[PDB]
Chains A and B, each alone.
Chain A
Amino acid sequence: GPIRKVLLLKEDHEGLGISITGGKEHGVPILISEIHPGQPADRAGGLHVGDAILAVNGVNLRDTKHKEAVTILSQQRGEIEFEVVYV
């Protein structure tokens, strides 16, 4: 699909509100597998189960291992831009 950029806003105590699968070692992009109700991704709208996360706040995730992506995603704070495409 077309690339979309979605702005999440999260408070300092919460997670992003997604589950992710995939990554370089699995031969597929980082993929959103769940969007958790009431958490930041859900509140933003515009994200979907099945979206690939190509980048977060300008960090390219297209060639990162799963745990590297988890770590980068976990470090984001406040206003967070996701670059996604529905695969």
Chain B
Amino acid sequence: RRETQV
């Protein structure tokens, strides 16, 4: 699953 911390 595409997941990014920002």
Contacts and interface: CB of A to CB of B under 8 A. Distances in A.
Query: Chain B: interface residue count, which band?
Result: under 10
A19 B2 contact: no
A66 interface: yes
A33 B6 CA distance: 11
B2 to A, nearest CB: 5
Contacts of A70: 4, 6
B6 A73 contact: yes
B1 A21 contact: yes
A26 B2 contact: yes
B5 A15 contact: yes
A23 interface: yes
Contacts of A47: none
